[PDB]
């Protein structure tokens, strides 16, 4: 019954379903985690907002056309205005976060096309002068 194509993800008060997935990637084979005392740096007791901020935020959609060349976002920038995550981000000097990224694009059995979806550490880009 269970399938590589069918998945549910629940975080906080939010749930995603998909019926045509292709497994899931865990970047570098490592699930996110909290910061251990033996690797810690700032010494103040941290804020861990948990369900208020660790939940799915849906960005404005973009349109894929035959002429589209692609899209980029940065993180945590893309979520800076998102609910309590954004508030916790901006009220503090320091923050760390992992992510579940879920990219959604359905069509039909008669459409064709392929999107590469990449998560890039330190995605530094060229300037235009």
């Amino acid at each position: 019954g269970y399938s590589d194509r069918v998945r549910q993800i629940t975080l906080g008060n939010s749930t995603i379903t998909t019926q045509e997935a292709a497994n899931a990637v865990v970047a570098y084979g490592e699930w996110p985690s909290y910061l251990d005392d033996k690797e810690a740096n700032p010494i103040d007791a941290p804020t861990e907002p948990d369900v208020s901020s660790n939940r799915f935020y849906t960005l404005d959609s973009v349109q894929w056309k035959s002429t589209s060349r692609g899209w980029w976002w940065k993180l945590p920038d893309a979520l800076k205005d998102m609910g309590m995550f954004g508030q916790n981000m901006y009220y503090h000097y320091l923050g760390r976060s992992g992510y579940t990224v879920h990219v959604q694009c359905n069509a039909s059995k008669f459409h064709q096309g392929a999107l590469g979806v990449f998560a890039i550490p330190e995605y530094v880009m060229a300037c235009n002068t």
Partner: peptide
């Protein structure tokens, strides 16, 4: 600091 703020454990 532990005398005047809440602190985490840092080794």
């Amino acid at each position: 600091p532990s005398d005047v703020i809440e602190t985490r454990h840092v080794v």
